[PDB]
Subunit: 337 residues, 2 copies
């Protein structure tokens, strides 16, 4: 097989380290093309490996030109950059696989981290120290405990549920969720969560809201002026799902107005964020309430180790012709959903 | 009765937030209550040194109320002058600014009360937050954003999950234990503790904790170390060059206990050299921290690994509400002559432990 790897020492998901699989592949007798050129090699690539952290767009055109293409692998989780409906439509026997579950703990941790950072007002506290100041009242006047807060998640899938699990020992007043399906009843009692049936009702009673839902027509621009006006005044909002779920200027406006006390997360639209993106400079009235990071929560070194191993497991299932894939990793199995 | 209340001035910040009870402007929310009861409340931030408002009122104060976040040093010399003193209250937890020893050894009839339990959840949250910020490399990541940069690889190269890490606490009291409880669902490899007494086995198992009998073998195996112990002869300068050398290489260290438990320059050294990947916490010595305290500018090889804050973890608005209420409850027990204090609040009761 000819394999095209698109990226950008426990680092793996960069074009210098090659998922740590460069030798794993050559000593199996394969040719590895690693790039950050790709269009040169698509006509004869049997396999294309991508990363959601520097996504190569597997467009309609590229699919067309890929006459040998049998397999696209996402070394991580997220297929937004692959034209899956087109592959499906073509009738071509192209499998698309991802390392389902490899990102979830990492992002769930990031969410809880961000909540604590916003709630406890960590950002301006640390900024005082490094700027050689000390004024405790300036920090404490907007520092709260996460204990006693009502916390709501929009989406209770793999990431959202793991968020709830990590919140349980923090003694929130209550954990709430909105989703398109019920959590299995045992799973629900294990975190003490209560399902709320509509989004407006959910956000109205929440001190902290976290967005853990797929981007689709239903969630695109979901967090807009109108919805934000139904949040508790002074709520904290975290989003590590997708940038496009929020209306960027609407969020910034709600933070400046005090509708939100804080906003944080590591997802942006457009991404990578323009130098001028409103979420870089937005602050609450106290000059804080911003816990934005670049999109990295799922590229910790521990995550990368899981992506590397998972990519090998997928490749081995393909090379052997066993196709003994994990049901959960399959996005398309020979063009089929 | 005359009550002297020593707190910080919050200035502009006390106007911003009604719930900031622990400042001179807001007076623990008890000023009108005391007034309606006919007591005289002197509220001050001026605690040093001799001509101070505190020292002016000491000779006839019946009650002195203090805060760990701006501690009035209730020294032997002040105790001797305080001819009317019957009660010292800590509006919070922490009594190292008060000469308990002298009161107890003399047998002077002075009670010393604190609001036990009111601080613990706040500090425990702060420790877990600080663990996450360090391990996940949050500080330099947030810095990229506000600086108008975007370079994921520069962050990801020193970013880990907390899952699968070995995490050890030095001290398993009220705070150390609540840290362990909050770490359980993060799936660490193992939770460990060092302490001078064992946790009961039910408490140990609730959190999957294993006792390690000495600090050297505790830190030797821990990816993350958190210090949750009182300052005494066993802990003063505990975290020094020698002990640091025994830490797992690239460890993260969190201290929300007392600054003097660490040797400051030793921690800075271990961070620069890579013995520690990160250090964070809200405690300093001296305190407040001088503008040139080494923990301000210290960083790891990548210019990060610093999650220090000023000393505030126990003074969130939620904690202040509990301090203010607990203080009022103590004063009520005193004023009524019931002396129905919560047993856990009593440090000394008329000079006796």
């Amino acid at each position: 097989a000819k394999i095209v790897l698109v990226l950008y020492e426990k680092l793996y998901g960069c074009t210098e380290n090659k998922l740590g699989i460069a030798n794993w592949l050559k000593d199996q007798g394969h040719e590895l093309i690693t790039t950050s050129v790709l269009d040169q090699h698509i006509p004869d690539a049997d396999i294309i490996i991508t990363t959601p952290f520097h996504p190569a767009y597997i467009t309609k055109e590229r699919i067309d030109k890929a006459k040998k293409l049998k397999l696209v692998v996402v070394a991580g989780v997220g297929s937004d950059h692959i034209d899956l409906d087109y592959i499906n439509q073509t009738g071509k026997k192209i499998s698309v696989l991802e390392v389902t579950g490899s990102n979830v703990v990492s992002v769930a941790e990031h969410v809880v981290m961000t909540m604590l950072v916003l709630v406890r007002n960590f950002v301006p506290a640390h900024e005082q120290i490094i700027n050689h100041d000390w004024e405790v009242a300036a920090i404490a006047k907007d520092a709260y405990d996460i204990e006693g807060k009502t916390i709501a998640t929009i989406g209770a899938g793999r990431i959202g549920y793991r968020v709830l699990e990590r919140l349980v020992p923090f003694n929130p007043k209550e954990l709430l969720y909105y989703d398109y399906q019920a959590l299995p009843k045992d799973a629900e009692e294990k975190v003490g969560a209560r399902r709320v049936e509509n989004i407006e009702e959910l956000v109205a009673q929440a001190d902290i809201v976290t967005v853990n839902a797929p981007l689709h027509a239903g969630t695109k621009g979901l967090i807009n002026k109108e919805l934000l006006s139904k949040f508790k005044k002074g709520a904290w909002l975290v989003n590590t799902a997708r940038g496009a779920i929020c209306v960027a200027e609407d969020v910034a406006a709600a933070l400046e107005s005090g509708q939100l006390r804080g906003y944080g997360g590591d997802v942006w639209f457009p991404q990578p964020a323009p130098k001028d993106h409103p979420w870089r400079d937005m602050r609450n009235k106290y000059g804080a309430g911003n816990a934005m990071t670049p999109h990295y929560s799922g590229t910790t070194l521990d995550a990368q180790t899981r992506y590397a191993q998972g990519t090998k497991n997928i490749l081995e299932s393909f090379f052997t012709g066993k196709f003994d894939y994990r049901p959960q990793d399959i996005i398309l199995l020979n063009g089929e959903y």
